[PDB]
Enzyme design. Structure first.
Site, PDB file in Angstrom:
ATOM      1  N   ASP B  25       0.763  -1.267  -0.147  1.00  0.00           N
ATOM      2  CA  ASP B  25       0.122  -0.147   0.085  1.00  0.00           C
ATOM      3  C   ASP B  25       0.744   1.363   0.184  1.00  0.00           C
ATOM      4  O   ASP B  25       1.137   1.645   1.056  1.00  0.00           O
ATOM      5  CB  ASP B  25      -0.909  -0.068   1.188  1.00  0.00           C
ATOM      6  CG  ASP B  25      -1.977   0.875   1.268  1.00  0.00           C
ATOM      7  OD1 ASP B  25      -2.008   1.903   0.422  1.00  0.00           O
ATOM      8  OD2 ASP B  25      -2.929   0.754   2.137  1.00  0.00           O
ATOM      9  N   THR B  26       0.917   1.779  -1.275  1.00  0.00           N
ATOM     10  CA  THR B  26       1.638   3.033  -1.134  1.00  0.00           C
ATOM     11  C   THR B  26       1.184   4.306  -0.545  1.00  0.00           C
ATOM     12  O   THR B  26       1.690   5.155  -0.337  1.00  0.00           O
ATOM     13  CB  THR B  26       2.248   3.618  -2.519  1.00  0.00           C
ATOM     14  OG1 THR B  26       1.093   3.634  -3.479  1.00  0.00           O
ATOM     15  CG2 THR B  26       3.089   2.449  -3.344  1.00  0.00           C
ATOM     16  N   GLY B  27      -0.224   4.188  -0.422  1.00  0.00           N
ATOM     17  CA  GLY B  27      -0.895   5.537   0.129  1.00  0.00           C
ATOM     18  C   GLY B  27      -0.916   5.436   1.666  1.00  0.00           C
ATOM     19  O   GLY B  27      -1.470   6.075   2.310  1.00  0.00           O
TER      20      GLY B  27
END
Ligand code: 6EG
Ligand code: CL
Ligand code: CL
Ligand code: CL
Ligand code: CL
Lengths: 99, 99
Positions: B25-27
């Site tokens: 999850d880059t967010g």
């Protein structure tokens, strides 16, 4: 480009002729932006986050430029903590994760 | 590997001698896993996103193997709807976004 993750992957997007800042989020199925005006009709959508579900407005076939890459797709509008670019548009711009 | 975004980027992780599935999850600034036991000291934290905030336990210096790559870092434990690998560990495995 190649974007490392030491800082948040924030990029500039262009929508409705205006620039905004948004987060490239591989953990998001969809794209959700903070309250704004979009053309046409909208449909209801419920999205689930870390704290539970929220109601958003779903707009289809919306022109949006992400880090200079043009996309046309679904944009949700609602009370998100930050503008989020989700997988529906990350796939349009040819984004992948690599390690 | 090169991980496509056509589907959710789910990978196998190994933590505390347990095999689990988790989302890259880059967010996410932090790594948050569904309820489990972890060794050592912990402190409470509130993390927020869509739907609001949740209370989690913060464990530091936790060893984690992600899709065969070793990483050490802070792991949050609490009522997340999905196991999330956040930026704090994605950087350690050399994960980047590319387009
Ligand atoms: C019913 O749910 C589904 O169908 N999909 C969920 C999904 O895609 N949600 C979604 C949709 C549109 C826009 C944004 C998001 C989540 C943003 C997150 C992802 O980045 N921020 C995390 C975050 C960021 C910052 C801070 N501070 C705290 C948290 C999904 C999931 C839910 C929670 C966490 C991670 C993934 C989901 C996937 C699999 C199984 C269940 C749910
Ligand atoms: Cl969220
Ligand atoms: Cl779309
Ligand atoms: Cl860390
Ligand atoms: Cl690096």
């Amino acid at each position: 480009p190649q974007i490392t993750l030491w800082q948040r992957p924030l990029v500039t997007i262009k929508i409705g002729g205006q620039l905004k800042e948004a987060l490239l989020d591989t953990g998001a199925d969809d794209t959700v932006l903070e309250e704004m005006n979009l053309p046409g009709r909208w449909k209801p959508k419920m999205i689930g986050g870390i704290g539970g579900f929220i109601k958003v407005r779903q707009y289809d076939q919306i022109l949006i430029e992400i880090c200079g890459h043009k996309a046309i797709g679904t944009v949700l509008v609602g009370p998100t903590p930050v503008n989020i670019i989700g997988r529906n548009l990350l796939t349009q711009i040819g984004c992948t994760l690599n390690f």
